[PDB]
């Protein structure tokens, strides 16, 4: 949000000394080209000397570099120096941003190119495996089984998650890998173009990862009642689940949108300068893991109550079947290892490098596991496909 601040600061600087063109006296000595070469504008009275004028104040780092001068030598014939092509030439290297800031930028651009290829290979591996797994929950009709029907509707809350994070990648590549050789092109690039697509997908993304984190709350509250834990009610059936799962973010994302569209339509609605307007959408996803933490610590108490009956089985499977469940369950219990406390208020340093790696790594691949644990490593869809392979042994 600094370049749109600068772009109107530039035009405010643009007519600033353009107004100072009106107060110019004519030449009393050797006059050079009294111009404004798109970044610096001078009173232009040299005694065959350089330019002792200040570096301009419309820089984003203007107070960091303020007490320095930009130089531009005029010749003894009233003419400034040039370049090889014929461009105007100045001395802005002493008023550049310092090389420490470019060096810390180039290393994190390697990091943000590392993460953005981390999930993109992950989501594309998931969304390729979800659509195979969401095919067999329709094609061999166990579709209305309420366990399968709440798993086929969790498979279609990952495709709506994975595709809507891949699009906001690709709509940050068009919007930020275009050349700016035309000054009039960036006059309209700030507001008009294929830019409302980056406003509709920035809500479609921020829906599709609150319509997924509240959708694991349903899969929490369905294993809560299928196993029959405490305060169990009557007629809590899955037409309530569709409303508390799909529609509950629609009580959250449009309150986030209209508190943003009223206040800031900055470049793609994605920047969070004020976390209080961003605390709306980080509130249920910090809630739907806090509730789903309980339904995980309850459900581990249920299998350790099954320790007794396994005497006729081998004793080296009380550790196996307690961990072949507690890896089989984390569709829901894969978060909350970092972001319970750090919560993006103060998490800087290498911690924000680390918090946004692990949660990015699991969530990019927790599509793939749940597509293969709950739809290929159960002995029903194998034994249905093992018959359909044998049914296709004659065509």
């Amino acid at each position: 949000q600094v370049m749109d601040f600068l772009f109107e600061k530039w035009k405010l600087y643009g007519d600033q000394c353009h107004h100072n063109l009106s107060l110019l006296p004519p030449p009393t000595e050797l006059v050079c080209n009294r111009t404004f070469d798109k970044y610096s504008c001078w009173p232009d009275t040299p005694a065959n000397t350089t330019a002792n004028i200040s570096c301009p104040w419309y820089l984003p780092w203007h107070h960091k570099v303020q007490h320095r001068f930009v130089f531009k030598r005029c010749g003894p014939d009233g003419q400034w120096v040039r370049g090889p092509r014929g461009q105007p030439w100045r001395d802005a290297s002493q008023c550049q941003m310092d090389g420490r800031e470019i060096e810390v930028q180039k290393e994190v651009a390697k990091m943000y190119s590392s993460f953005q290829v981390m999930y993109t290979v992950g989501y594309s591996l998931s969304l390729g495996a979800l659509l195979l797994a969401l095919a067999i929950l329709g094609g061999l009709s166990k579709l209305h089984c309420t366990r399968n029907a709440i798993h086929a509707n969790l498979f279609a809350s990952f495709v709506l998650k994975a595709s809507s994070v891949l699009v906001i990648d690709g709509l940050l590549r068009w919007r930020y890998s275009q050349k700016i050789g035309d000054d009039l092109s960036v006059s309209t690039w700030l507001s008009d173009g294929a830019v409302a697509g980056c406003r509709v997908a920035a809500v479609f993304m921020q829906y599709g990862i609150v319509a997924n984190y509240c959708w694991l709350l349903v899969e929490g509250l369905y294993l809560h009642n299928l196993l029959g834990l405490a305060t169990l009610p009557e007629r809590s059936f899955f037409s309530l689940y569709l409303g508390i799962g799909w529609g509950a973010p629609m009580l959250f994302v449009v309150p986030w949108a209209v508190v943003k569209c009223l206040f800031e339509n900055v470049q793609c609605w994605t920047s969070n300068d004020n976390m209080g307007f961003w605390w709306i959408l980080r509130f249920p996803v910090f809630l739907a893991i806090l509730i789903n933490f309980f339904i995980f610590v309850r459900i581990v108490q249920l299998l350790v109550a099954k320790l007794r009956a396994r005497q006729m089985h081998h004793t080296d499977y009380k550790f196996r079947l307690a961990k072949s469940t507690l890896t089989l369950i984390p569709l829901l219990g894969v978060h909350e290892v970092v972001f319970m406390f750090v919560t993006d208020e103060h998490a800087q340093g290498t911690l924000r490098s680390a918090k946004l790696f692990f949660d990015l790594f699991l969530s990019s691949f927790q599509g793939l596991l749940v597509a293969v644990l709950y739809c290929f490593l159960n002995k029903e869809v194998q034994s249905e496909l093992r018959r359909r392979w044998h049914r296709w042994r004659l065509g």
Partner: peptide, 29 residues
């Protein structure tokens, strides 16, 4: 929430990349 932080630091960065490259267009032209 992570992609609401990661992308909200990606575009918080990627804005300031072109903001430097806008100055790199004002120089050298």
């Amino acid at each position: 929430h992570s992609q609401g932080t990661f992308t909200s630091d990606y575009s918080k960065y990627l804005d300031s990349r072109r903001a430097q490259d806008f100055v790199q267009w004002l120089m050298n032209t």
